[PDB]
Amino acid sequence: YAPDARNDAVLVYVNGQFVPRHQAVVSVFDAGYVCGDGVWEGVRLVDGRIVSFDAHIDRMYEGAKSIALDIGMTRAQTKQVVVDTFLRNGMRDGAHARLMVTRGVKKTPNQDPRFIIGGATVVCVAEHKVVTPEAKRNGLKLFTSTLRCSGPDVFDLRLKSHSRLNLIQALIQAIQAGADEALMLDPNGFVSSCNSTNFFAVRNGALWTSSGRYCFNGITRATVVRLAREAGIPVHEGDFTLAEVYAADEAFVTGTLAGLTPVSSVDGRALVPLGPLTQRLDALYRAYIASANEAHGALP
Amino acid sequence: YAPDARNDAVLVYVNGQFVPRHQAVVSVFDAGYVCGDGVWEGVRLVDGRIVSFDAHIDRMYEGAKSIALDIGMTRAQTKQVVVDTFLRNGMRDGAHARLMVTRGVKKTPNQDPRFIIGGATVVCVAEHKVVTPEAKRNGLKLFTSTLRCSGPDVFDLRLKSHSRLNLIQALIQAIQAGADEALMLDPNGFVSSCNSTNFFAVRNGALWTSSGRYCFNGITRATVVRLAREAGIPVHEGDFTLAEVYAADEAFVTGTLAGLTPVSSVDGRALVPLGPLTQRLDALYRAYIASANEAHGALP
Amino acid sequence: YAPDARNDAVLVYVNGQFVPRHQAVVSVFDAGYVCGDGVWEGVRLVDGRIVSFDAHIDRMYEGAKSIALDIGMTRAQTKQVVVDTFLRNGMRDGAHARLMVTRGVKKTPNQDPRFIIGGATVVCVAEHKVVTPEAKRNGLKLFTSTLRCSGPDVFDLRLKSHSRLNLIQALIQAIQAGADEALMLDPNGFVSSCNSTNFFAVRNGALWTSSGRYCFNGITRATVVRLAREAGIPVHEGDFTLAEVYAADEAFVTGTLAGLTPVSSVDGRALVPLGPLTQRLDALYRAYIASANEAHGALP
Amino acid sequence: YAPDARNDAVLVYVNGQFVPRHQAVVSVFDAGYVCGDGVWEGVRLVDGRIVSFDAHIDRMYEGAKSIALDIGMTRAQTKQVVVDTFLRNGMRDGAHARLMVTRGVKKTPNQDPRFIIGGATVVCVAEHKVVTPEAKRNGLKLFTSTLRCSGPDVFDLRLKSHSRLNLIQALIQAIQAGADEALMLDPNGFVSSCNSTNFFAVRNGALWTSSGRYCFNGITRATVVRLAREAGIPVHEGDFTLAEVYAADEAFVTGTLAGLTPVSSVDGRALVPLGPLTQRLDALYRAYIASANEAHGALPAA
Amino acid sequence: YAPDARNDAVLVYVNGQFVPRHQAVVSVFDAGYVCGDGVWEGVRLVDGRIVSFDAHIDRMYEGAKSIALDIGMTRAQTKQVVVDTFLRNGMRDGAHARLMVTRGVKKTPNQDPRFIIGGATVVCVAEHKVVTPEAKRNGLKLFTSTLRCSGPDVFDLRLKSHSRLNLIQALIQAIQAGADEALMLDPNGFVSSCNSTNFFAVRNGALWTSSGRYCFNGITRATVVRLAREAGIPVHEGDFTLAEVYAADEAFVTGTLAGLTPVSSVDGRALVPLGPLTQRLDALYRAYIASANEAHGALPAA
Amino acid sequence: YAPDARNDAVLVYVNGQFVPRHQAVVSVFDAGYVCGDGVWEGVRLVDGRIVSFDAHIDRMYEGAKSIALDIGMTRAQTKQVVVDTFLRNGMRDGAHARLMVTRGVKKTPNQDPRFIIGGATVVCVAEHKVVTPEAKRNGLKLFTSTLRCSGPDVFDLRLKSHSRLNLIQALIQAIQAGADEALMLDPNGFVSSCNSTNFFAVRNGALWTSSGRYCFNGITRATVVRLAREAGIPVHEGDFTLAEVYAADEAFVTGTLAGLTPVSSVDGRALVPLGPLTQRLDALYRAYIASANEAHGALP
């Protein structure tokens, strides 16, 4: 994400006030800081539209619901927080907002979610975040961590939460292998996802990606699958192995921030970055997020 | 933990400064708040000695090491932070300190642990925390959550971390069952631990507790096992079932904060709280933490 | 399922004879009583027709086959036992028959299935069983037990057997949570079924239910899936989580006895009982069981 | 268990009454028949003593407790049921009693354990059951079933219950392999137990048996381990494999009914039945069950 | 595979040379012999065509790629090895070639795949292998081994490798049960495959086979599924149980060597061999392998 | 293991004959080459004694027994093959023999073990193999592969077999991470062993190593455990984690070929090679293998 001096003077939304980023703060009694106890969303602003905005806010509401966290706001109010954060920083384009809603402040740090004073802590950081396509062109080195995605009875990886050491530990190992991102296997040993992005492989003209049973169900992921199906591109959504990845023609990772990022290697096995099907899906994706489809909520 | 107006005016240690608790804050760019990315310790102050102090600080150093987090301080400096926090609030007794060390502030929120400006964020909250023995006498209702302790390849539960939604989710379900705390099973179905405390059962004069393979290895836990062995009390450290708990004579939970807290029921099956062996071990425990054993680091 | 004094004088089929309910008995040497060793079926009589009758009898024959149990009767003879049980109690409507076929009497209690004198014990209990729709309207509290559905290499839950402590133990825990029925997870942590009924959730106008890989594949379940597809309702058969359940709009359970029973809560998270799609499917189901249909067996 | 015509006329205890075996019956509404919903115990009478009697009754009370089943009786009363069953059939020796306590009768068959009329159904079948030591000498063929012991969160195998299709299905497969009993693996693939007995192997003059974390913790099992430790026979309670079994010098199975029964093969691999250590442990066991030990309950000389 | 004296004098391809079968040899330093470290393929010659030839060669190249093994040859060259082996033995029909490519010779036996002198060892054994349809008619006894298919993070069973003790051990147990082949379960307990062939069951006029997530994805398997779908025979690729197998009307196993082989029993439960749907699929398969389809590679009329 | 031109002219034992290394061959019909179907042993010759010789031969006999492979030889005859291989190459010291017994030649390649003509193929390769202690001093980089040790119902890793792609695949990944050897986890996630050697860690003056339930139970491993207990060093055989490894003071790997080899890093976390306890145990081991001891077999 290619740097920008405007990032240094962005205003941050904190419980209704707009604060210089150097002074944007939360209490050391906040459930987020203490316990990792909240949910969050990343949404990208493209030519005056927030990409998949309503989808992201639905997901936030579902994730909060799953950990019995009261956002303290209607869907409309939650969206206006994001809209006002972009507006306050004069952003219409090339911008990314992180919306963080943590459970709130506690009289004393504990795990019990009932003992909360006020309501949810709401933070929105909006920044200038444009991927310089030298990063697109070279792509990512992936290493398959020894650390596994969890089953939902242990920790549901569909939740976009403030408790992220599970993923960070996978990343640390991949970095120590000389890589940029971690590929993770599911509890059965099949390819699941990456530590911060979803994972796709390309094999004989077809797009392969996990079931999503044991990883984050990214909106970029679901859009890319949808565009592929709509374009008549065969999709295999289900169980595949490292052997199938190693013999793949192409691969890429997805997320709101980078979009489609090519993979140049997995476990040291080279893949041509920006193969022909990655390019085709990339074209479809960028067309979709830059279009007047109102899945992309219009900025006031 | 029976309330105290002195709690409202405690000074909090934050990166070297002492701050009123109403104004003790960390950046919304801090790895703790964003990612749940740090380690912590609770230590109890008893008659001018910090209980098991050196043990807790060793554990912190090991946990930080496991997630490649630089505390940025020697063991001596880390202890002086705690000592000075107690000292600054005029505490010699009936006090508990939470020491929180999060990875630090980032230019932009991400998972990558390398992109850190300055070093570790260090917070120490010291409070007046005395359990009113009406809480001892009645004990806790436990419910066995459907949510499981993880294996170490998924998320090592020996780590005392800022990523706690795994445990909090277990708690939420136990509360909805009408209970106070959650009992958790290991991935094989055997009794592991509670969501915020360790778990013991008593059967025919013997103390039963998990292997600790799949839960937090509490210092209170290890002290209680040690005192029991030293007193000739038979200990079974290993795999046991809910059936064995349900047929138990007594049970209790351990942690720095409450010490030994009796259990009055598990899954609705009554147990006499403060049975005769809980009382005996409780006597030994309190004697140990109030003694001039220098495992209890002496306050300057 | 709301009382009727005719229940006290029903005749029970026992190995070819019809016996007063207070005198209907099996030997203490019977494999059913000793070992839980048999299969059973519940079939409902509606307006002169046995609902899905041949489906139930095929299932019985497959289940018996799986545990190498010789029913001792043709499909025709098995059906006539049920038909004659209804007939003997003058039942045309609002009645339920339990058909129990246990392995038989043994010289001595053991598990060896070959040491059997005579054939299968065959019992049929028919009762007057109408759900008073105040039970429909208020619905069930569900609690997700810590006890799991098994895989087929442990014990295949497709079998409708006399060995039911696996399910009853899940129920006992849910009752102690203040609930009416137990929701059960599969060995991978995904929602599977209830202890005595199959489980559906409703989310965004679609119906969600397990794969059935790890639970009882109820005929009511399969009928409701078919009716939903018939009526243009999207159906998602597969792996879903407690998070997805907790965010659902409606939920209900299925079985021959109650039909569709709404769910009022799961793990303490409230759901409005008799939501709009539960109503719709309930209407379709009742129409189906009261129609002439070739799936239904005619009473003479 | 080598046959005896007296078995045909034994009286059976059924809720306080003593009934001819041809007429010993339970209601078709009983949770035992319907749901497999009860616990049971087998106890052996040897020379006027019920072997390990209080241990069996403790186990019953714990197992009942685990499925929230009220036996309806004190430990004393439960024992008298067994004692009276032996007494009523004039049995002083060479006899086995199966005590079955099911949850009771229900107004309608369901799973809900609350809706019970009366109390527990209590049945006690006592029979003349003496193993003719030609059965000892030849021993059992074992086959390792594909069907697995469960973990405790699925179904705890320490419970001696009326729900036995889990074990029966393992047996069915072993019989179809030409064997007499099923060996079962635990969820991790280590040797656990047999479908109706516990399992021991002998290797390098030491005794090997499972941890018991994933199988029935037999009283015969616990006695054999204790006698071995008392006698300086090395005993290893823990995880071992089929490879270790296949290389073993001897093996045997334990249970109240047969005592120690030698194994003649596992998965087709021959083992000499009644090897030297099986014999030695067998001698110790029989001496123990024929002793005046206060683990054994006195039968009245009545 | 019903015998033929010509098998005794076949020439074997060994790194470019054609050698009498009595003298076809590899070094004791070869990774294949030492470590089980190679991939292989079986291909069948039918009326001048190598059945599914390019599919087998694709699979080999993927499997080699998965264990970072350099075959040392283009796809073209690899095919010519097979073609020349058939040609050298004057085989136009009724013949099977096993192509074995092991990692090569090492200066010293170790696991490290880098320290290799020369390239891959390439062996091709072609034999006369025609199944006498008395073997078709009677079919196979299956026993479900206690030994399990692995997940891909333990050992991926899609790889056709020189490390086969995992499958052989399942076979050993099934033979000791009186059977001919082993049925294996997946890590979750569902039916996966057989130790040397894929597994199908027939139930209510539909064909059932595993997902293939936990077993060898046979080309015969994939062909049979495709022919069934093409013909409007319902096919269910997914998880099913032993209970479903035991209640099945028919079953069969697939592989390049035998084609479709009926099953006469599973765990002692009899199945009529060559049931009506097995026959129909068998007819379709034989027609397919005897067709001019561009899936099949031409053998020179040389 | 540092080169010697005598290796080029060693004679190899092949079914009773002694053959030049360049001409030592097995049939392409041999179960070893085709199927990986055999067992092997490495034994080291030190100052006229074969280290732990009878232990290795007992192990071979047990492994063969487990896969129903008839060695075709008494223990005495098996040993004489090794002894004669050493003798024929004039080796008294600094030599290693690999004894390979594969199932034999088959009429046709298949997996069925009964279709064997003649008996076991027996091969013995003896070489001059001295570790130049610059290899000792620098030690090994370890990477924890994503590929797991199996349980015994999948494939028992106590067996020293000719089917080694399970271990080699773990190695390939570790090499691609920039490491020398692979650390492997057990099916529960705990540290098990290395791909070709056993694994120890040192923490606070104690030695830690796996239970051996899920890996090769090396003779060097058992010797080092025994020497440690002999020398008053606490030994912890059981389940431990990557976190515990990462915080360790030292680590090393064991095997007949190298003896004790220090570890310089695990997953990129540095460990000082030849720490004080590794040195101590290394001294004890070398003393042991150079002593007269009854465990050692005398060369004639």
Short mmCIF file of N, CA, C and O in Angstrom, two decimals, chain E residues 21 24-29 32-37 67 98 100 107-109 111-112 114 123 127 147-148 150 153 155 161-165 167-169 172 195-196, chain F residues 21 24-29 32-37 67 98 100 107-109 111 123 125 127 129 147-148 153 161-165 167-169 171-172 175 195:
data_model
loop_
_atom_site.label_atom_id
_atom_site.label_comp_id
_atom_site.label_asym_id
_atom_site.label_seq_id
_atom_site.Cartn_x
_atom_site.Cartn_y
_atom_site.Cartn_z
N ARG E 21 13.59 -59.94 -18.14
CA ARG E 21 12.94 -59.70 -16.85
C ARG E 21 13.72 -60.30 -15.66
O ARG E 21 13.70 -59.72 -14.55
N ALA E 24 16.33 -57.57 -14.96
CA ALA E 24 15.93 -56.19 -14.78
C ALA E 24 16.15 -55.82 -13.31
O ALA E 24 15.51 -56.40 -12.45
N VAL E 25 17.03 -54.84 -13.07
CA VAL E 25 17.63 -54.52 -11.79
C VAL E 25 17.79 -52.99 -11.69
O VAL E 25 17.95 -52.26 -12.70
N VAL E 26 17.72 -52.52 -10.41
CA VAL E 26 18.07 -51.18 -9.98
C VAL E 26 19.12 -51.28 -8.87
O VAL E 26 19.19 -52.29 -8.15
N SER E 27 19.94 -50.22 -8.74
CA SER E 27 20.92 -50.08 -7.68
C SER E 27 20.29 -50.11 -6.29
O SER E 27 19.23 -49.57 -6.08
N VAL E 28 20.99 -50.71 -5.33
CA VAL E 28 20.57 -50.69 -3.94
C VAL E 28 20.72 -49.28 -3.32
O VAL E 28 20.16 -49.05 -2.25
N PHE E 29 21.38 -48.33 -4.02
CA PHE E 29 21.38 -46.92 -3.64
C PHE E 29 20.23 -46.09 -4.24
O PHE E 29 20.17 -44.87 -4.02
N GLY E 32 14.08 -45.36 -4.72
CA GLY E 32 12.91 -46.21 -4.78
C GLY E 32 13.00 -47.39 -3.82
O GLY E 32 12.04 -47.66 -3.09
N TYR E 33 14.10 -48.14 -3.92
CA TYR E 33 14.38 -49.30 -3.08
C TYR E 33 14.56 -48.87 -1.62
O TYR E 33 14.06 -49.51 -0.71
N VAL E 34 15.30 -47.79 -1.39
CA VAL E 34 15.70 -47.41 -0.04
C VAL E 34 14.55 -46.76 0.75
O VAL E 34 14.40 -47.01 1.96
N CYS E 35 13.87 -45.82 0.08
CA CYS E 35 13.03 -44.80 0.72
C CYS E 35 11.57 -44.93 0.24
O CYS E 35 10.67 -44.29 0.78
N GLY E 36 11.29 -45.79 -0.76
CA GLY E 36 9.97 -45.82 -1.38
C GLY E 36 9.66 -44.56 -2.18
O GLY E 36 8.50 -44.23 -2.35
N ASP E 37 10.70 -43.89 -2.69
CA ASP E 37 10.66 -42.50 -3.13
C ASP E 37 10.58 -42.45 -4.67
O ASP E 37 11.60 -42.36 -5.38
N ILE E 67 6.05 -34.23 -4.79
CA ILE E 67 7.24 -34.63 -4.01
C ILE E 67 8.55 -34.08 -4.63
O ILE E 67 9.63 -34.60 -4.35
N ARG E 98 3.30 -51.05 -16.18
CA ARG E 98 3.66 -50.31 -14.98
C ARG E 98 4.92 -49.47 -15.23
O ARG E 98 6.00 -50.01 -15.53
N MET E 100 7.51 -46.92 -13.67
CA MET E 100 7.99 -46.55 -12.34
C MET E 100 9.12 -45.55 -12.51
O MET E 100 10.05 -45.82 -13.26
N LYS E 107 24.66 -41.00 -3.42
CA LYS E 107 26.02 -41.38 -3.05
C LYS E 107 25.93 -42.18 -1.75
O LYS E 107 26.61 -43.19 -1.63
N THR E 108 25.04 -41.74 -0.84
CA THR E 108 24.75 -42.48 0.38
C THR E 108 23.24 -42.45 0.63
O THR E 108 22.60 -41.42 0.38
N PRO E 109 22.63 -43.55 1.15
CA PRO E 109 21.22 -43.53 1.49
C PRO E 109 20.90 -42.50 2.57
O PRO E 109 21.51 -42.51 3.64
N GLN E 111 17.36 -39.27 3.22
CA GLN E 111 16.06 -38.73 2.81
C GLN E 111 16.16 -37.48 1.92
O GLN E 111 15.22 -37.17 1.16
N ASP E 112 17.29 -36.77 2.02
CA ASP E 112 17.44 -35.51 1.33
C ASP E 112 17.36 -35.69 -0.19
O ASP E 112 18.24 -36.30 -0.81
N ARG E 114 17.92 -33.74 -2.71
CA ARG E 114 18.82 -32.98 -3.55
C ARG E 114 20.06 -33.77 -3.97
O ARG E 114 20.64 -33.40 -4.98
N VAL E 123 11.72 -47.18 -14.97
CA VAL E 123 11.48 -48.57 -15.29
C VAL E 123 10.08 -48.70 -15.86
O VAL E 123 9.15 -48.12 -15.34
N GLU E 127 3.43 -56.45 -19.18
CA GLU E 127 3.04 -57.86 -19.12
C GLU E 127 1.72 -58.10 -19.85
O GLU E 127 0.93 -57.16 -20.01
N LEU E 147 -7.45 -50.09 9.79
CA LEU E 147 -6.48 -49.09 9.34
C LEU E 147 -7.15 -48.14 8.36
O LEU E 147 -7.89 -48.53 7.47
N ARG E 148 -6.83 -46.85 8.54
CA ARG E 148 -7.58 -45.74 8.00
C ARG E 148 -6.75 -45.11 6.91
O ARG E 148 -5.54 -45.05 7.04
N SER E 150 -5.37 -41.73 5.29
CA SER E 150 -4.83 -40.53 5.93
C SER E 150 -5.46 -39.30 5.30
O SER E 150 -5.81 -39.28 4.12
N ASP E 153 -2.58 -33.66 5.02
CA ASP E 153 -1.51 -33.21 5.91
C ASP E 153 -0.71 -34.32 6.61
O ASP E 153 0.22 -33.96 7.34
N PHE E 155 -0.49 -37.84 4.86
CA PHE E 155 0.01 -38.43 3.63
C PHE E 155 -1.14 -38.42 2.63
O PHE E 155 -2.19 -39.04 2.89
N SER E 161 2.37 -43.76 -5.36
CA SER E 161 3.77 -43.70 -4.94
C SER E 161 4.36 -45.09 -4.70
O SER E 161 3.64 -46.08 -4.68
N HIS E 162 5.70 -45.10 -4.49
CA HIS E 162 6.47 -46.28 -4.14
C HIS E 162 6.50 -46.54 -2.63
O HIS E 162 7.23 -47.41 -2.17
N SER E 163 5.72 -45.78 -1.85
CA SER E 163 5.59 -45.98 -0.42
C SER E 163 4.22 -46.60 -0.11
O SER E 163 3.28 -45.88 0.11
N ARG E 164 4.08 -47.92 -0.04
CA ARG E 164 2.76 -48.55 -0.06
C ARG E 164 2.48 -49.39 1.17
O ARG E 164 1.45 -50.05 1.20
N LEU E 165 3.30 -49.27 2.25
CA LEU E 165 3.06 -50.06 3.42
C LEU E 165 1.75 -49.64 4.10
O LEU E 165 1.14 -50.47 4.78
N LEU E 167 -1.13 -49.04 2.64
CA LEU E 167 -2.16 -49.83 2.01
C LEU E 167 -1.96 -51.30 2.27
O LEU E 167 -2.94 -52.01 2.48
N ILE E 168 -0.70 -51.77 2.20
CA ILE E 168 -0.37 -53.18 2.40
C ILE E 168 -0.83 -53.64 3.79
O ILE E 168 -1.28 -54.76 3.95
N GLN E 169 -0.67 -52.80 4.79
CA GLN E 169 -1.05 -53.20 6.15
C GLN E 169 -2.56 -53.38 6.26
O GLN E 169 -3.02 -54.26 6.94
N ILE E 172 -3.16 -56.85 4.72
CA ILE E 172 -2.78 -57.92 5.61
C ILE E 172 -3.94 -58.26 6.55
O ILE E 172 -4.30 -59.42 6.68
N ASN E 195 -7.82 -50.97 -0.72
CA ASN E 195 -6.38 -50.85 -0.61
C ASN E 195 -5.68 -50.74 -1.97
O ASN E 195 -4.58 -50.25 -1.98
N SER E 196 -6.24 -51.28 -3.07
CA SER E 196 -5.54 -51.30 -4.37
C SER E 196 -6.43 -50.87 -5.53
O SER E 196 -5.92 -50.80 -6.64
N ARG F 21 30.08 -52.08 -4.91
CA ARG F 21 29.03 -51.08 -4.68
C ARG F 21 28.34 -50.60 -5.97
O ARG F 21 27.11 -50.41 -6.00
N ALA F 24 25.93 -53.45 -6.93
CA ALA F 24 25.00 -54.01 -5.97
C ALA F 24 23.59 -53.61 -6.38
O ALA F 24 23.29 -52.42 -6.39
N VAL F 25 22.75 -54.63 -6.63
CA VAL F 25 21.48 -54.49 -7.33
C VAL F 25 20.43 -55.42 -6.71
O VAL F 25 20.74 -56.43 -6.08
N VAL F 26 19.16 -54.99 -6.89
CA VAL F 26 17.96 -55.74 -6.57
C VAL F 26 17.06 -55.75 -7.81
O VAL F 26 17.11 -54.83 -8.65
N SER F 27 16.26 -56.82 -7.92
CA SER F 27 15.30 -57.01 -9.00
C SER F 27 14.26 -55.89 -8.98
O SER F 27 13.84 -55.44 -7.89
N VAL F 28 13.80 -55.47 -10.17
CA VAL F 28 12.71 -54.52 -10.25
C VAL F 28 11.36 -55.15 -9.83
O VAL F 28 10.38 -54.40 -9.61
N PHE F 29 11.33 -56.49 -9.64
CA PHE F 29 10.18 -57.17 -9.03
C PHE F 29 10.22 -57.23 -7.48
O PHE F 29 9.32 -57.80 -6.86
N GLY F 32 10.65 -54.14 -2.09
CA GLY F 32 11.27 -52.93 -1.60
C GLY F 32 11.17 -51.75 -2.58
O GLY F 32 10.81 -50.63 -2.21
N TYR F 33 11.57 -52.02 -3.81
CA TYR F 33 11.61 -51.05 -4.89
C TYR F 33 10.18 -50.72 -5.31
O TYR F 33 9.88 -49.57 -5.59
N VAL F 34 9.31 -51.72 -5.40
CA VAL F 34 7.99 -51.51 -5.98
C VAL F 34 7.06 -50.77 -4.99
O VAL F 34 6.31 -49.88 -5.41
N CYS F 35 7.06 -51.24 -3.75
CA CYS F 35 6.00 -51.03 -2.77
C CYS F 35 6.57 -50.34 -1.51
O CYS F 35 5.82 -49.84 -0.67
N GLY F 36 7.89 -50.19 -1.37
CA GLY F 36 8.47 -49.69 -0.13
C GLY F 36 8.37 -50.70 1.00
O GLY F 36 8.43 -50.31 2.15
N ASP F 37 8.30 -52.00 0.67
CA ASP F 37 7.79 -53.03 1.55
C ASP F 37 8.97 -53.82 2.18
O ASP F 37 9.46 -54.79 1.62
N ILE F 67 4.51 -56.19 10.06
CA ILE F 67 4.06 -56.29 8.66
C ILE F 67 4.16 -57.73 8.11
O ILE F 67 4.17 -57.93 6.91
N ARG F 98 23.85 -50.13 7.07
CA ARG F 98 22.43 -50.17 6.80
C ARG F 98 22.03 -51.59 6.39
O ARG F 98 22.53 -52.12 5.39
N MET F 100 19.01 -53.87 5.22
CA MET F 100 17.72 -53.74 4.58
C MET F 100 17.20 -55.14 4.27
O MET F 100 17.92 -55.98 3.70
N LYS F 107 6.11 -62.56 -8.71
CA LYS F 107 5.87 -62.95 -10.09
C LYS F 107 5.47 -61.71 -10.87
O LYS F 107 5.98 -61.48 -11.96
N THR F 108 4.61 -60.88 -10.25
CA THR F 108 4.13 -59.64 -10.81
C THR F 108 4.06 -58.59 -9.70
O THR F 108 3.75 -58.93 -8.56
N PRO F 109 4.31 -57.29 -9.98
CA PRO F 109 4.14 -56.26 -8.97
C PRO F 109 2.69 -56.13 -8.52
O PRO F 109 1.80 -55.92 -9.33
N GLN F 111 0.54 -55.71 -4.21
CA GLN F 111 0.72 -55.44 -2.78
C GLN F 111 0.53 -56.72 -1.95
O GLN F 111 0.96 -56.76 -0.78
N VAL F 123 19.93 -57.05 2.16
CA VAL F 123 21.01 -56.19 1.72
C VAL F 123 21.66 -55.54 2.93
O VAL F 123 20.97 -55.03 3.81
N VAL F 125 24.63 -52.53 3.36
CA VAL F 125 25.57 -51.54 2.89
C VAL F 125 26.34 -51.02 4.10
O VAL F 125 25.74 -50.49 5.05
N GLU F 127 29.48 -48.44 5.12
CA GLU F 127 30.28 -47.31 4.68
C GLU F 127 31.09 -46.71 5.82
O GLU F 127 30.76 -46.90 6.99
N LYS F 129 31.78 -43.58 7.81
CA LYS F 129 30.86 -42.48 8.08
C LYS F 129 31.25 -41.86 9.43
O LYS F 129 30.80 -42.33 10.49
N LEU F 147 3.23 -30.84 7.72
CA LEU F 147 2.90 -32.26 7.61
C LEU F 147 3.22 -32.99 8.92
O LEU F 147 4.27 -32.78 9.51
N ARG F 148 2.29 -33.87 9.32
CA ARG F 148 2.10 -34.36 10.65
C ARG F 148 2.56 -35.80 10.70
O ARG F 148 2.41 -36.55 9.75
N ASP F 153 -3.23 -46.27 13.84
CA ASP F 153 -4.27 -46.69 12.90
C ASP F 153 -4.16 -46.15 11.46
O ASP F 153 -5.02 -46.49 10.63
N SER F 161 10.92 -48.43 8.21
CA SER F 161 10.46 -49.09 6.99
C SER F 161 11.06 -48.47 5.73
O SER F 161 11.66 -47.41 5.79
N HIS F 162 10.82 -49.14 4.60
CA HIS F 162 11.21 -48.70 3.26
C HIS F 162 10.15 -47.79 2.62
O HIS F 162 10.22 -47.53 1.44
N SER F 163 9.12 -47.39 3.37
CA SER F 163 8.08 -46.51 2.90
C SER F 163 8.25 -45.14 3.56
O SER F 163 7.64 -44.92 4.60
N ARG F 164 9.04 -44.22 2.98
CA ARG F 164 9.53 -43.06 3.72
C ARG F 164 9.09 -41.72 3.15
O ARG F 164 9.54 -40.70 3.65
N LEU F 165 8.13 -41.70 2.21
CA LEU F 165 7.75 -40.46 1.56
C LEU F 165 6.99 -39.62 2.58
O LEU F 165 7.00 -38.41 2.42
N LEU F 167 7.90 -39.00 5.66
CA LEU F 167 8.93 -38.21 6.30
C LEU F 167 9.62 -37.29 5.30
O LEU F 167 9.96 -36.15 5.65
N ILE F 168 9.87 -37.77 4.08
CA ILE F 168 10.57 -36.99 3.08
C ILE F 168 9.76 -35.74 2.72
O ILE F 168 10.33 -34.68 2.45
N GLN F 169 8.44 -35.86 2.60
CA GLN F 169 7.60 -34.72 2.29
C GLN F 169 7.72 -33.63 3.36
O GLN F 169 7.70 -32.45 3.00
N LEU F 171 10.43 -33.12 5.12
CA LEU F 171 11.75 -32.56 4.83
C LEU F 171 11.74 -31.56 3.70
O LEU F 171 12.34 -30.50 3.79
N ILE F 172 11.06 -31.89 2.60
CA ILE F 172 11.03 -31.02 1.43
C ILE F 172 10.52 -29.65 1.84
O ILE F 172 11.10 -28.65 1.45
N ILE F 175 13.26 -27.74 3.91
CA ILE F 175 14.32 -27.26 3.03
C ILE F 175 13.87 -25.98 2.32
O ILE F 175 14.64 -25.01 2.21
N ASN F 195 12.17 -35.47 11.00
CA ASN F 195 11.96 -36.37 9.89
C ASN F 195 12.94 -37.54 9.85
O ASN F 195 12.56 -38.51 9.25
#
